[PDB]
Protein backbone atom coordinates (compact mmCIF):
# COMPACT_ATOMS: atom_id res chain seq x y z
CA UNK A 1 0.00 0.00 0.00
CA UNK A 2 2.53 2.57 1.26
CA UNK A 3 5.61 1.75 -0.88
CA UNK A 4 8.87 3.75 -0.88
CA UNK A 5 9.46 3.26 -4.64
CA UNK A 6 13.22 3.01 -4.52
CA UNK A 7 16.11 1.21 -2.85
CA UNK A 8 16.38 0.57 0.88
CA UNK A 9 19.89 1.80 1.45
CA UNK A 10 21.34 3.38 4.50
CA UNK A 11 22.71 6.22 2.49
CA UNK A 12 20.65 7.49 -0.36
CA UNK A 13 22.16 10.85 0.36
CA UNK A 14 25.17 10.66 -1.93
CA UNK A 15 23.37 8.89 -4.78
CA UNK A 16 20.18 11.00 -4.78
CA UNK A 17 22.10 14.27 -4.43
CA UNK A 18 24.28 13.43 -7.43
CA UNK A 19 21.34 12.12 -9.47
CA UNK A 20 19.30 15.33 -9.09
CA UNK A 21 22.41 17.31 -10.09
CA UNK A 22 22.81 15.11 -13.15
CA UNK A 23 19.10 15.39 -14.00
CA UNK A 24 19.25 19.20 -14.02
CA UNK A 25 22.44 19.39 -16.08
CA UNK A 26 21.08 16.99 -18.69
CA UNK A 27 17.89 19.00 -19.05
CA UNK A 28 19.89 22.20 -19.38
CA UNK A 29 22.58 20.73 -21.65
CA UNK A 30 21.44 17.49 -23.28
CA UNK A 31 23.96 15.56 -25.37
CA UNK A 32 23.36 15.87 -29.12
CA UNK A 33 20.48 13.70 -30.37
CA UNK A 34 19.78 12.36 -26.89
CA UNK A 35 17.28 12.76 -24.09
CA UNK A 36 16.96 11.23 -20.63
CA UNK A 37 14.85 11.53 -17.49
CA UNK A 38 13.01 9.61 -14.77
CA UNK A 39 10.08 7.43 -15.86
CA UNK A 40 7.99 8.28 -12.80
CA UNK A 41 8.49 8.81 -9.06
CA UNK A 42 11.78 6.91 -8.70
CA UNK A 43 14.78 9.09 -9.58
CA UNK A 44 16.83 5.86 -9.71
CA UNK A 45 14.90 4.63 -12.82
CA UNK A 46 15.40 6.72 -15.95
CA UNK A 47 14.48 6.37 -19.58
CA UNK A 48 16.45 7.64 -22.54
CA UNK A 49 15.80 8.29 -26.21
CA UNK A 50 18.69 8.23 -28.67
CA UNK A 51 18.50 9.01 -32.38
CA UNK A 52 20.81 6.85 -34.46
CA UNK A 53 23.92 8.99 -35.14
CA UNK A 54 23.84 10.78 -38.52
CA UNK A 55 26.02 9.12 -41.12
CA UNK A 56 25.66 5.80 -39.35
CA UNK A 57 23.76 2.74 -40.50
CA UNK A 58 21.41 3.52 -37.57
CA UNK A 59 20.44 6.91 -38.99
CA UNK A 60 16.76 7.67 -38.76
CA UNK A 61 16.31 5.10 -36.01
CA UNK A 62 14.80 5.98 -32.65
CA UNK A 63 16.33 3.97 -29.81
CA UNK A 64 15.07 3.75 -26.24
CA UNK A 65 17.28 2.95 -23.26
CA UNK A 66 16.58 1.96 -19.65
CA UNK A 67 18.88 3.56 -17.09
CA UNK A 68 18.87 2.26 -13.53
CA UNK A 69 21.07 3.78 -10.83
CA UNK A 70 21.99 2.15 -7.54
CA UNK A 71 22.59 3.70 -4.07
CA UNK A 72 26.30 3.33 -4.82
CA UNK A 73 26.22 5.99 -7.54
CA UNK A 74 28.50 7.69 -8.67
CA UNK A 75 31.00 5.10 -7.42
CA UNK A 76 29.29 2.21 -9.25
CA UNK A 77 28.19 2.66 -12.86
CA UNK A 78 24.49 2.80 -13.71
CA UNK A 79 22.94 -0.12 -15.54
CA UNK A 80 22.06 0.81 -19.16
CA UNK A 81 20.28 -1.39 -21.71
CA UNK A 82 18.70 -0.94 -25.12
CA UNK A 83 15.01 -1.72 -25.32
CA UNK A 84 14.75 -1.25 -29.04
CA UNK A 85 16.14 -4.22 -30.93
CA UNK A 86 19.42 -3.25 -32.65
CA UNK A 87 21.93 -4.98 -34.96
CA UNK A 88 25.36 -4.27 -33.51
CA UNK A 89 28.32 -6.47 -32.49
CA UNK A 90 28.50 -5.05 -28.94
CA UNK A 91 24.78 -5.18 -28.03
CA UNK A 92 23.07 -8.50 -27.48
CA UNK A 93 19.50 -9.61 -28.13
CA UNK A 94 18.34 -8.39 -24.70
CA UNK A 95 20.00 -4.97 -25.11
CA UNK A 96 23.01 -5.60 -22.86
CA UNK A 97 25.83 -3.29 -23.89
CA UNK A 98 29.55 -4.13 -23.95
CA UNK A 99 31.15 -0.75 -23.23
CA UNK A 100 34.31 -0.17 -21.17
CA UNK A 101 33.08 2.78 -19.09
CA UNK A 102 30.04 0.75 -18.05
CA UNK A 103 32.25 -1.80 -16.31
CA UNK A 104 35.99 -1.46 -15.62
CA UNK A 105 36.53 2.05 -16.96
CA UNK A 106 33.75 3.58 -14.86
CA UNK A 107 34.84 6.68 -12.94
CA UNK A 108 32.91 8.92 -10.52
CA UNK A 109 33.95 11.74 -12.86
CA UNK A 110 31.74 10.32 -15.60
CA UNK A 111 28.14 11.48 -15.90
CA UNK A 112 25.11 10.05 -17.62
CA UNK A 113 25.56 12.57 -20.45
CA UNK A 114 28.99 11.10 -21.03
CA UNK A 115 27.60 7.57 -21.05
CA UNK A 116 25.18 8.63 -23.81
CA UNK A 117 27.90 10.34 -25.89
CA UNK A 118 30.02 7.15 -25.60
CA UNK A 119 27.03 5.02 -26.51
CA UNK A 120 26.55 7.21 -29.56
CA UNK A 121 30.20 6.84 -30.45
CA UNK A 122 29.94 3.06 -29.98
CA UNK A 123 27.10 3.03 -32.54
CA UNK A 124 29.23 4.74 -35.15
CA UNK A 125 32.38 2.76 -34.24
CA UNK A 126 31.69 -0.79 -33.09
CA UNK A 127 34.34 -2.49 -30.95
CA UNK A 128 34.84 -5.92 -32.58
CA UNK A 129 37.64 -6.67 -30.09
CA UNK A 130 35.06 -7.25 -27.29
CA UNK A 131 32.09 -8.74 -29.18
CA UNK A 132 28.74 -9.52 -27.63
CA UNK A 133 27.18 -11.08 -30.75
CA UNK A 134 29.72 -13.29 -32.45
CA UNK A 135 28.17 -13.62 -35.91
CA UNK A 136 27.65 -9.85 -36.08
CA UNK A 137 31.20 -9.03 -34.97
CA UNK A 138 32.41 -11.63 -37.49
CA UNK A 139 30.27 -10.20 -40.27
CA UNK A 140 31.41 -6.70 -39.31
CA UNK A 141 34.99 -7.65 -40.06
CA UNK A 142 34.72 -10.01 -43.02
CA UNK A 143 31.58 -8.79 -44.83
CA UNK A 144 31.10 -5.14 -43.90
CA UNK A 145 28.62 -4.42 -46.69
CA UNK A 146 26.35 -7.20 -45.49
CA UNK A 147 26.66 -5.97 -41.92
CA UNK A 148 25.56 -2.49 -42.98
CA UNK A 149 22.65 -3.84 -45.03
CA UNK A 150 21.41 -5.74 -41.98
CA UNK A 151 21.89 -2.87 -39.52
CA UNK A 152 19.99 -0.62 -41.91
CA UNK A 153 17.23 -3.16 -42.38
CA UNK A 154 16.92 -3.67 -38.61
CA UNK A 155 16.83 0.09 -37.97
CA UNK A 156 13.96 0.41 -40.42
CA UNK A 157 12.08 -2.58 -39.00
CA UNK A 158 12.62 -2.18 -35.23
CA UNK A 159 13.63 1.42 -34.49
CA UNK A 160 10.76 3.39 -35.98
Amino acid sequence: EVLFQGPNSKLLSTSAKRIQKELADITLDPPPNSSAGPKGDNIYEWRSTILGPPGSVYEGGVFFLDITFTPEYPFKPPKVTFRTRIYHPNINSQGVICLDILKDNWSPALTISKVLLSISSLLTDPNPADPLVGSIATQYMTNRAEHDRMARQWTKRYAT
Binding site: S93, V96, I97, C98, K103, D130, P131, L132, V133, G134
Partner: peptide
Protein backbone atom coordinates in the same frame (compact mmCIF):
# COMPACT_ATOMS: atom_id res chain seq x y z
CA UNK B 1 31.30 -8.48 -20.82
CA UNK B 2 28.62 -10.79 -19.48
CA UNK B 3 25.77 -11.79 -21.80
CA UNK B 4 27.69 -13.07 -24.85
CA UNK B 5 25.64 -14.65 -27.70
CA UNK B 6 26.86 -16.47 -30.80
Amino acid sequence: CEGYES
